[PDB]
Design a protein around this ligand. Structure first.
Ligand code: HEM
Ligand code: HEM
Ligand code: HEM
Ligand code: HEM
Lengths: 139, 146, 139, 146
């Protein structure tokens, strides 16, 4: 489970992201599409080029999901229930790909929050994204 | 592990700016802190009980220097990683029996350290080139399993 | 989560394993040690040769853990709490290795229960062992 | 992928008894049922809504035949799996973009099918030999990613 220190760390790192949440989610998706091209196939109706309004809009959706998970960290299976259905049933997302996006979210936070991305907060964020990934693959 | 010249360019230019006394130790420490089962292989290093204890451990810094040196080695022989890493593969696979998934993890942790240290400069294209690199290194280090 | 059908399938497959549970756990461990030699390092104080009394005794321990999980399938985190602490904190078991032993447990069941190991029951067993592995890696 | 002669002996002797019209379809069907995200690559096969629908689907059996033939091909060329699987690697990696973890999964599912069909004859040493084989195939099929 996420410890009290993990929940504190995650909350604090997210607090520093501020209104950049949407932009950082877009950047994480771009990092994943470029670094792990196999993931691109899940978005054939997207233009994945840099500056894509569709990647921008989706990055905000993703960030908002993660923020809802942070806000309901003690109740994530419930909070993310509908997204778990979507990702397993309709989209059939390979579980490997949650590891790839989680890593790209970490890289994005590290590139943008030098003071906050300490080894401890990096550990807490990895456990948080792993927890989100476990829920999203639960169905 | 074929990098395009633009990939090679992005990789080599950033790497010249890397503090090779420190970055390998940052990566190894984070590996032990983020993936604590890896501490199984480093019990002789002493106090690993807290993140501060790990990051400040002199043996962590010292050993990470050698790890980073092997990455630097691979960056010089990108088109022959298997040969460069044969001895380390024998060591990690035949002697140490480290599961090779942890080679992937250390490579991803290194990438996180580079992002942390270089910020904006660690662009998504630069990352994608480094991912090809750390993937190639892990695969070469795992050859003795294949 | 495990569906009602999954719970039924796992229950029934376990029912047919019967008093061979301890033996099958020992065989799964042997299959793992031979197939995935990296796992051997977790048992230095064990003789891992065929017919080892220590592999036999540990297979029973493992089978009893899985039977407790089957019996408390709706409360696995609590039922397996003490074992999750043991595996993450003291033993520091690499999470990859739970995948390897789960596979070997499936192989052992398939080799012994030809009538019960249908594609559906195989799917349910895989989900059950994945759920056990998630708990055992949760700390 | 070095099988000892005892390993080669264990593998080839069991393989001669495999029903090559059926076992590949059994393995592909189980892959789709146990790991349903793989159904994303086989939407053209039609009804996959239930396990029975999958296992009795004629497209599943017919395509599984070809899959098993590739395994059979690899079993003949253990010393050059890279070469044997180059064409399929381009298809699965560059054209299909299947994550290579799923090559490992199909290999493990094949191993479960062999265990199911051969019972006690699928001894732990025979399994350990087959695991070397399905690892070698997955690695060669993934070479266009490496
Ligand atoms: C951190 C983990 C993830 C989160 C929080 C997340 C979040 C979301 C959300 C909130 C939506 C709904 C968008 C909407 O309603 O308009 C969505 C849709 C979608 N997700 Fe994810 N996701 C995650 C992981 C992934 C991964 C790893 C993949 C594939 C590689 C993926 C592929 C998709 C696709 C294809 C859609 C449908 C997009 C569309 O058609 O507009 N997701 N995701
Ligand atoms: C990309 C991945 C890796 C690289 C490039 C790397 C590199 C190195 C190098 C250069 C050495 C020094 C060998 C010598 O003294 O000649 C070493 C030793 C060692 N490595 Fe790694 N390593 C990697 C991954 C890992 C991982 C993931 C683990 C465990 C979690 C590990 C465990 C060890 C241990 C225990 C030693 C000391 C061996 C001894 O002195 O007997 N390595 N590694
Ligand atoms: C299906 C998943 C697993 C179950 C149900 C399980 C169960 C158990 C149980 C019940 C014990 C306690 C035995 C006792 O009290 O004497 C134990 C100990 C242990 N487990 Fe596991 N385990 C699992 C996975 C693993 C894996 C994957 C590894 C390593 C590859 C592992 C390594 C160990 C070790 C080294 C011990 C201590 C053995 C000793 O020193 O006597 N376990 N496990
Ligand atoms: C060891 C693993 C695998 C082997 C040996 C294998 C073998 C084959 C073979 C022999 C074909 C026929 C190619 C032809 O028509 O010439 C094929 C096609 C195909 N494979 Fe696999 N395969 C493997 C894994 C996978 C996995 C895991 C997936 C997806 C989850 C996948 C998706 C496909 C698809 C979609 C096709 C049809 C491609 C087309 O006709 O355009 N393969 N594979």
């Amino acid at each position: 489970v996420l410890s009290p220190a993990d929940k504190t760390n995650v909350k604090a790192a997210w607090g520093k992201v501020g209104a950049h949440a949407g932009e950082y989610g877009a950047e994480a998706l771009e990092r994943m599409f470029l670094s792990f091209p196999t993931t691109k196939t899940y978005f054939p109706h997207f233009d994945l080029s840099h500056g894509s309004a569709q990647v921008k809009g989706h990055g905000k959706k993703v960030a908002d999901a993660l923020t809802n998970a942070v806000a309901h960290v003690d109740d994530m299976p419930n909070a993310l229930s509908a997204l778990s259905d979507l990702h397993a049933h309709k989209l059939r997302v390979d579980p490997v790909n949650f590891k790839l996006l989680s890593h790209c979210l970490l890289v994005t936070l590290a590139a943008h929050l030098p003071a906050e991305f300490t080894p401890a907060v990096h550990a807490s964020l990895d456990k948080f994204l792993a927890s989100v990934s476990t829920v999203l693959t639960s169905k | 592990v074929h990098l395009t010249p633009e990939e090679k360019s992005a990789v080599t230019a950033l790497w010249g700016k890397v503090n090779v006394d420190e970055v390998g130790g940052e990566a190894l420490g984070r590996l032990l802190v983020v993936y604590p089962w890896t501490q199984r292989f480093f019990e002789s290093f002493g106090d690993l009980s807290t993140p501060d204890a790990v990051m400040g451990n002199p043996k962590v810094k010292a050993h990470g220097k050698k790890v980073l040196g092997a990455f630097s080695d691979g960056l010089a022989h990108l088109d022959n990683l298997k040969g460069t890493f044969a001895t380390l593969s024998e060591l990690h696979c035949d002697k140490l029996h480290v599961d090779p998934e942890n080679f992937r993890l250390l490579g991803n942790v290194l990438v996180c350290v580079l992002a942390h240290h270089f910020g904006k400069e660690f662009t998504p294209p630069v990352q994608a080139a480094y991912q090809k690199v750390v993937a190639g290194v892990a695969n070469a280090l795992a050859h003795k399993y294949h």
